[PDB]
């Protein structure tokens, strides 16, 4: 998840020469790119904006998974979003695997796994 899909064959190729060697593109080589990446998506301007205003997190998860094959596993939420008074602190904290009934706010980020396009 964290290194970028390091593979034993790539390990051996590095170990042989202690460097990365360039390679001409081939269909099997170009098919190695099709793997997920970690990203953060905003709920302000997007297809999921309708779910931003008080919608359930589970609905967002299911919709993203069905439509874009996008796996959402966490919420990056403003620290003072729960407070009634407005604040200038832009610090956000992490919520891991929110339940189905969790309520979203428009000022949230979603941890997602994006399929290559």
């Amino acid at each position: 998840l964290v290194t970028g899909g390091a593979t034993p064959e790539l390990e051996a190729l590095i170990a042989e020469e202690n460097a990365l060697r360039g390679g001409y593109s081939t269909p099997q080589t170009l098919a190695n790119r099709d793997r997920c990446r970690v990203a953060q998506l905003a709920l302000l301007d997007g297809p999921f904006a309708d779910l931003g205003d008080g919608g359930c997190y589970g609905d967002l998860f299911c919709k993203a998974l069905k439509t874009y094959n996008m796996l959402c596993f966490g919420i990056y939420r403003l620290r003072d979003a729960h407070l009634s008074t407005p604040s200038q602190c832009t610090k956000r904290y992490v919520i891991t695997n929110p339940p189905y009934e969790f309520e979203l706010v428009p000022t949230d980020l979603i941890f997602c796994l994006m399929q290559f396009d």
């Binding site: 170990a15 042989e16 020469e17 202690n18």
Partner: protein
């Protein structure tokens, strides 16, 4: 011999001496190894080529004693690097001698042959 020209040169039935040495490392007497290999009772066609794989900074300290021998080559590199070993035709050599040229290492005794074992 750089990697490319060492690969271009063909080495068969030779001797590869892999040494782990630095500028401040103790001087093992490499003449005591090459000299018995050039003993004048071997015909000149029977002499074995000797290629030293190691730091050139270390081998500069001993070339003043090794420069008077017929066929000696040096490949600046590391004995633990497979690129140099493949460039020097390690699979075609008559002998590979892995020397602990950094014998002056003072540590736990068992961790004194770590480089040779690796």
């Amino acid at each position: 011999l750089t990697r490319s020209e060492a690969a271009m040169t063909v080495l068969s039935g030779h001797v590869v001496v892999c040494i782990f040495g630095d500028v401040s490392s103790a001087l093992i007497g490499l003449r005591n190894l090459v000299m018995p290999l050039r003993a004048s009772n071997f015909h000149y066609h029977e002499l074995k080529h000797i290629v030293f794989v190691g730091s050139i900074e270390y081998l500069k300290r001993e070339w003043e004693t090794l420069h008077n021998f017929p066929k000696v080559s040096i490949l600046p590199g590391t004995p633990l690097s497979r690129a140099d070993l493949r460039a020097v035709n390690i699979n075609l050599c008559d002998m590979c001698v892995i020397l602990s040229a950094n014998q002056n290492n003072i540590d736990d005794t068992s961790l004194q042959d770590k480089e040779c074992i690796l």
